[PDB]
Amino acid sequence: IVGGYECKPYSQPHQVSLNSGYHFCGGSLVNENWVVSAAHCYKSRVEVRLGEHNIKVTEGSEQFISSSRVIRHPNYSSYNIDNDIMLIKLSKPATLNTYVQPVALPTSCAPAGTMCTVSGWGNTMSSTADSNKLQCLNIPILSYSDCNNSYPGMITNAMFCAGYLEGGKDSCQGDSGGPVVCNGELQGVVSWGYGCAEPGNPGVYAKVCIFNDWLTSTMASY
Ligand SMILES: [Ca+2]
């Protein structure tokens, strides 16, 4: 996260770290058994780390749970990074508590100009922010027209842009798969962009609200 601030610890208790020997992507707990992340973060098995603030220090709030299932959206495409959404089933349920709480799936698609929060342990491009401590940033949803204008013909129905076209504030490498929360619901998944925090190149997010039927049907299986 570029141009943000250190989150109040555990103020984003749905935020998880996906780990394969090291942090490589974020995700969001959506109930005690499932995490939503980005398809481009796929690995066939991952360790989900919940209850984190400082991913380098053992704080006593953590739960580390291996995945049992990693499910890419069936129509994920790297041409465009389209349908950039994945479900991770936990091999055992998470214990919900002060530090670990699921975020709700959207009851609507948030409109342009809605202010949201994005968070992660990705690159901060900053001499004073510490990516080891979960970072937070408030970003507004941009219009489809501004989004498409920034990346002509690459913005599909499954994407939205959010952030600041003037630059300086954005999600970045290592934030991928993490949440965009708007009015307390998971509206976005950190997906792609040209660079980070560059003028005219806003962040692009998977648009969770149009995936709800795929998400809930997939989670209904056991
Ligand atoms: Ca920790």
Swiss-Prot record:
Disulphide bond pairs: 7-136, 25-41, 109-209, 116-182, 147-161, 172-196
A GO molecular-function descriptor: metal ion binding
Cofactor stoichiometry and binding remark: Binds 1 Ca(2+) ion per subunit.
SUPFAM superfamilies per UniProt: Trypsin-like serine proteases (SSF50494)
Binding, Ca(2+): 52, 54, 57, 62
Cofactor(s) for this UniProt protein: Ca(2+)
Record's protein name: Trypsin-1
Organism: Salmo salar (Atlantic salmon)
